[PDB]
Amino acid sequence: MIKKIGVLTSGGDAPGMNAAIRGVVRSALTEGLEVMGIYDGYLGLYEDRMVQLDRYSVSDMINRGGTFLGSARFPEFRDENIRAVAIENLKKRGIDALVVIGGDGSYMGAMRLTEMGFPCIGLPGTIDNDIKGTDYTIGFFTALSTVVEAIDRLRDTSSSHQRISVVEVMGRYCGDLTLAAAIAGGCEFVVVPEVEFSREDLVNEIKAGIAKGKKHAIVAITEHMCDVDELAHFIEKETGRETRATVLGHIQRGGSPVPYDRILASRMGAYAIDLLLAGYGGRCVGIQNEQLVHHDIIDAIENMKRPFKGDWLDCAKKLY
Amino acid sequence: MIKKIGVLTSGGDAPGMNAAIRGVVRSALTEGLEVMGIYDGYLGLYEDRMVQLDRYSVSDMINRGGTFLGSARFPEFRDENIRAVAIENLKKRGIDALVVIGGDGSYMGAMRLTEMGFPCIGLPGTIDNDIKGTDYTIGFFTALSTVVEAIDRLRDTSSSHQRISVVEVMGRYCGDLTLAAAIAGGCEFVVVPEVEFSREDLVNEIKAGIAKGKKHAIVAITEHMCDVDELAHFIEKETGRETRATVLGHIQRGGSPVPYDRILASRMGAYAIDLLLAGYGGRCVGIQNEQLVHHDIIDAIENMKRPFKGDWLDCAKKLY
Amino acid sequence: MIKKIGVLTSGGDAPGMNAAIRGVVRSALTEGLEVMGIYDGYLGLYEDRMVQLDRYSVSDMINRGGTFLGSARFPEFRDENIRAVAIENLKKRGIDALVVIGGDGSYMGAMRLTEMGFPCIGLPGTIDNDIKGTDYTIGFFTALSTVVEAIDRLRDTSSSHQRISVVEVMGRYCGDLTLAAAIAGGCEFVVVPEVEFSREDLVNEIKAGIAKGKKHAIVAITEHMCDVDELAHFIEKETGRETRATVLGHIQRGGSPVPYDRILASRMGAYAIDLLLAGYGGRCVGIQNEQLVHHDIIDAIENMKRPFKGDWLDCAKKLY
Amino acid sequence: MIKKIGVLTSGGDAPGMNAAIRGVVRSALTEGLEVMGIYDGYLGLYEDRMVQLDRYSVSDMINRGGTFLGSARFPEFRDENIRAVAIENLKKRGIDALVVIGGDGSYMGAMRLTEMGFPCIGLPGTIDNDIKGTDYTIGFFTALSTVVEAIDRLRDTSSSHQRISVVEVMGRYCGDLTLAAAIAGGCEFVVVPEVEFSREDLVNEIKAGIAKGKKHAIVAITEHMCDVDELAHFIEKETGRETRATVLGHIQRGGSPVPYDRILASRMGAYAIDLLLAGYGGRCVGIQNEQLVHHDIIDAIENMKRPFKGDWLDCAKKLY
């Protein structure tokens, strides 16, 4: 079967979500399917706030950050009774399946829907690059460029004043963004959650650099590891060089998607449709060793471990 | 007289400084003069740290941020005895005049040295836009782009989530940055130090916005006015909408100068030399109503005044 | 009187046209006026293709290139009989006046409408910076940045191979864009329509540069002056250095507007409304010596001469 | 053995080359080796033009385009006698191995030198993406952004005017650039050299587009396939819609490397040295399915093959 499908964006927004939706809509249409766009992820589902999507409703969207459909958190969705009101709207709208774009929270919702007879496909949308079974997630590369662009500006100013700059990068519990940024910006030190942090190894590395004539030091550090103001104070004390802490924040979440994002989103969206049409349900799409793959949601969540990019850390240390 | 001139960068670095230097060196060379570059602003002047500059030393500098001579904050320059040393260094090297590129603070140093008999020329180099006698200062336009770009990015994320975003802008005690940025980013409310700040008006304006169906709200505020974190929480409580505070910081000070900065800097550089060959000293260059102008330093510091830009603000409120 | 007004964009598009329209709409609304948006400039007028514009129809437009209303050429409009069908649509729609955003072609149309009892205000929209009675036009600064961004990339590649690069810049019969670009990119030679071109002065300047150790030469040249392929061949022959010609083209017309554009458009749009309300008609808005001014359209067109930016050319030559 | 290595950049410059060099120099230093930088690719090798490189010579290079050692197209390197001279220069300087960074052509030189007994290592440096045994080459991603950005800009102008835009992309005999660009810019039609070009299909697709109400149409075509000017006129006649051809040119080759290039380059650089210390020679590094890999040069040049990317193209047509 499957005549009509639903699409939503749930969880934290990431550049390339619009490309993904377009990817879905255009794929669907071409295959003679009808498409409903659901507002504010799962909440919109619950409240029955939807719209009919044609090919033009996804035009002028490919090079746009955010999610035109909106995103929202709806913890309640974990309650089967809430999902019962959800399913009724589905029947009542004649939706046969959905494509969900989000993180792991979103994939769980989607698993719940599948066992209730509404096959769902999950696509990775997040700048954190922390979803299992994918080398990359949509929004990663866009954030990477925002961060590096920031580090470039900081180098200019840091040089001018022979300063040390600490930069707090997003990623929550994943150091991928930090680490990649650090290589690309030629940072002097990197602090990621996956490695034990030694304030001491840091100090030594900075002084060694200073002894070598380095005019500036740039420290890349993942958020939630310490208070960057405290850390800046500590460095200034112990090194005699004025330190300045910078917290990029939410700028990392916005802006026009980079080509990698535009293209990954596009390809993923199209593969979503092909999956539904071949009868799959409760799968999460991913990109592994440059190949598009699909896994059972439960399998990916409970059975896969997020590998540590050790080879990139080794490389980082050699180019200091 | 006047066969050899000196040139330094003082105070907070600003994009376009390299362009100003290049302006100076190239003009001077063409007029048969010799140029000495003083390192680390007033610190290298005191420590007698200088190098000779040829036409090639300013090559590949026009599109770079920072200052290759370095800059410093040497508060001790306030002492008339330290300035005594600096002047001796100047005479020993055979230097006839000095070209100082910096902010309001650097203008004071230049003034003090003029008062001592050493002829200087001040060029407005600061992202802040706070020097008297000039519509703009080198680096303003560049920082304006860094900021506006940041804002374009926050509009995307706060829209996807129906959030309120508080952006803290540099400027110190000047609102130009914050104000030009709020109009260019189409901000909901602007808070500057030249106008009385009313938590009331802010909440009321925002609420109004929500009534009319605005998906996001961007509030642009000058630094040192409050705790954006405290202010953020306060907004969240009073409106029921999630709020996020972003502190741009030091990214505003770096990066490749925008066209305007590159050009202004070059023009002021060439003009400095013209003034020198004419026999003027103790003067500062500015751009006034599209005209390259010079004033007695003393006149600018003391008896000039900052124009209340009700003009930009009345327009700002109209477009909300 | 005046209860309702019309707005259109005519002639070649330029970044910041959307900011201008927003500027008008929001200003109008705030003043209790109603607003019609006319499609494809004057053609749309003729054919009666309009829409009602509210405050939301101009949202998410400020940072967007192009004109959402469209532009189109309609030479026929010069015929009074065509204008008669135009006026009937106006009456029939109850439009009392219009704000026209374009070039001088557009201003003439607008003059015609005024004498026929429908007061029109003209705003400068064009990357050429060639409208009389304005220091700048909307779109100029955005193009300037696109060109300089291009020149920066060309320097990198030119250096690597010790090449000469000729870059053809837009501007039609005005060298403002070329000249500004040349200073900002540190070009070795500039060719603008306003100055007699000597292939010889060019060759000499290039060899002198080459004799001096210059690793690259960048030549900035305004379009319609020669065939850049022919000119590249000529340079290669006479200098022994491989030459490459680059024609930027239409990339110059697009992209997100720079802050200067966002703000000039905004201010101009708002001033348009104030003019209509004070009873003026048949005026063209401009920015002169940092002041917003208005002139009689005929006066501006037939009586003002486009000044030559001689002071910028003098400066260009000194920094070679 | 192996105490001193050499490093050069050959062929068409590519953004990330500076990053590759830095990769090499920094790794080598760390392993106790000595590094010689050869100027102007195979030309300086022949003329024996070299410099010693320390850790500081590669500082401030990571974010810059081009190559600071220079590059050259020295066709004469084809002569076995010229290569005889080059090898003598190498032995006289005490150099044990060579690291060559260039394209398909440079790989031939490296191969010929290996054949003569001098051990080399090839690193894929070219915007084209045409080397066998690597998914990507240094500079590809950067040129992809230069292009996509160009396209975002043309969408704005061609939309305001209901125009068709023909964009000519670099690549030589490889379609990757053109193809990735067409999907990322949401192009209407793509013309590449790996597929048969049908003027018919093109007009028919475009006409289709107009039927469905498309305001613009962007056609992305690889260079050396036709005369975009001729093709432009042909389209204009057959569709009644104004067409414009834009030739991106050399802007594609320059500018600051994107994050991906910066990182890949660093990683390949470090890897070269590892291979050297292991005793391998006559090898070339590539990135295959996210893995750093090495192959016998000979194997890559001769018996490897280019993968028909029907995959990207089938998806391209789906999203139109």
Ligand SMILES: Nc1ncnc2c1ncn2[C@@H]1O[C@H](COP(=O)(O)OP(=O)(O)O)[C@@H](O)[C@H]1O
């Ligand atoms: N029915 C329509 N009415 C108006 N504009 C349209 C229509 N369909 C497409 N367009 C416009 O034409 C351009 C190209 O359309 P399309 O190829 O579908 O967009 P995209 O490349 O962004 O996917 C865009 O500016 C789009 O907004």
Ligand SMILES: Nc1ncnc2c1ncn2[C@@H]1O[C@H](COP(=O)(O)OP(=O)(O)O)[C@@H](O)[C@H]1O
């Ligand atoms: N176990 C679950 N069962 C059902 N729905 C869930 C479950 N976990 C999360 N969700 C739904 O997914 C939404 C997003 O979850 P969250 O953890 O916030 O995001 P992410 O997908 O980014 O990890 C939640 O608000 C809720 O609607």
Ligand SMILES: Nc1ncnc2c1ncn2[C@@H]1O[C@H](COP(=O)(O)OP(=O)(O)O)[C@@H](O)[C@H]1O
């Ligand atoms: N009153 C003063 N007398 C003499 N020198 C001064 C005076 N004020 C500032 N300076 C010098 O100018 C430097 C830069 O000033 P500052 O206010 O910190 O920044 P900026 O010039 O960037 O605005 C000071 O560090 C000091 O060397």
Ligand SMILES: Nc1ncnc2c1ncn2[C@@H]1O[C@H](COP(=O)(O)OP(=O)(O)O)[C@@H](O)[C@H]1O
């Ligand atoms: N003596 C020299 N040796 C090497 N490179 C030089 C020399 N003089 C100039 N160059 C290089 O040649 C290019 C052109 O120089 P120039 O026009 O003077 O630089 P800019 O445009 O930055 O003012 C630049 O990349 C510069 O670094």
Ligand SMILES: Nc1ncnc2c1ncn2[C@@H]1O[C@H](COP(=O)(O)OP(=O)(O)O)[C@@H](O)[C@H]1O
């Ligand atoms: N009635 C509405 N419905 C949906 N979104 C709206 C509405 N009004 C405004 N918005 C959105 O809220 C944001 C801010 O609105 P507004 O201040 O009017 O835009 P802008 O700053 O671009 O002028 C934009 O993303 C806009 O699209």
Ligand SMILES: Nc1ncnc2c1ncn2[C@@H]1O[C@H](COP(=O)(O)OP(=O)(O)O)[C@@H](O)[C@H]1O
């Ligand atoms: N003398 C005129 N009288 C009436 N309408 C005119 C006149 N000149 C131009 N127009 C109108 O203005 C439009 C734009 O003119 P054009 O010269 O193409 O542009 P621009 O305003 O950019 O100079 C024309 O298509 C026509 O509709």
Ligand SMILES: Nc1ncnc2c1ncn2[C@@H]1O[C@H](COP(=O)(O)OP(=O)(O)O)[C@@H](O)[C@H]1O
């Ligand atoms: N068959 C060959 N034998 C020896 N050297 C070669 C051969 N082909 C190319 N080269 C050398 O490699 C250089 C660069 O090659 P080219 O094809 O022009 O560019 P790229 O390496 O950038 O792809 C040539 O100029 C020449 O010095």
Ligand SMILES: Nc1ncnc2c1ncn2[C@@H]1O[C@H](COP(=O)(O)OP(=O)(O)O)[C@@H](O)[C@H]1O
């Ligand atoms: N000996 C030195 N003298 C002057 N500046 C130096 C020296 N060594 C490094 N630097 C400068 O200090 C900063 C940090 O150096 P480094 O980390 O080695 O550069 P990069 O990050 O580009 O690898 C750079 O701006 C660089 O040019």
Ligand SMILES: O=P(O)(O)OC[C@H]1O[C@](O)(COP(=O)(O)O)[C@@H](O)[C@@H]1O
């Ligand atoms: O948007 P919030 O709620 O302020 O949360 C910030 C967090 O969300 C992220 O920006 C991205 O998270 P997602 O996994 O939901 O996409 C993290 O990097 C960051 O820690």
Ligand SMILES: O=P(O)(O)OC[C@H]1O[C@](O)(COP(=O)(O)O)[C@@H](O)[C@@H]1O
């Ligand atoms: O760079 P510091 O020493 O942390 O000081 C930051 C201050 O300098 C500035 O960045 C620039 O101001 P000045 O040019 O006057 O120094 C201010 O906006 C900011 O308040």
Ligand SMILES: O=P(O)(O)OC[C@H]1O[C@](O)(COP(=O)(O)O)[C@@H](O)[C@@H]1O
């Ligand atoms: O868009 P077209 O018709 O190809 O014309 C190109 C011309 O239009 C411009 O791009 C701008 O012209 P406008 O005065 O109409 O805005 C010129 O720079 C260029 O010569």
Ligand SMILES: O=P(O)(O)OC[C@H]1O[C@](O)(COP(=O)(O)O)[C@@H](O)[C@@H]1O
């Ligand atoms: O730079 P040139 O000598 O004009 O040649 C241009 C050619 O070089 C490239 O820019 C890059 O190709 P290579 O790296 O193989 O030299 C091609 O895309 C283009 O065809």
Ligand SMILES: [Mg+2]
């Ligand atoms: Mg979660």
Ligand SMILES: [Mg+2]
């Ligand atoms: Mg470093």
Ligand SMILES: [Mg+2]
């Ligand atoms: Mg100051």
Ligand SMILES: [Mg+2]
């Ligand atoms: Mg707004």
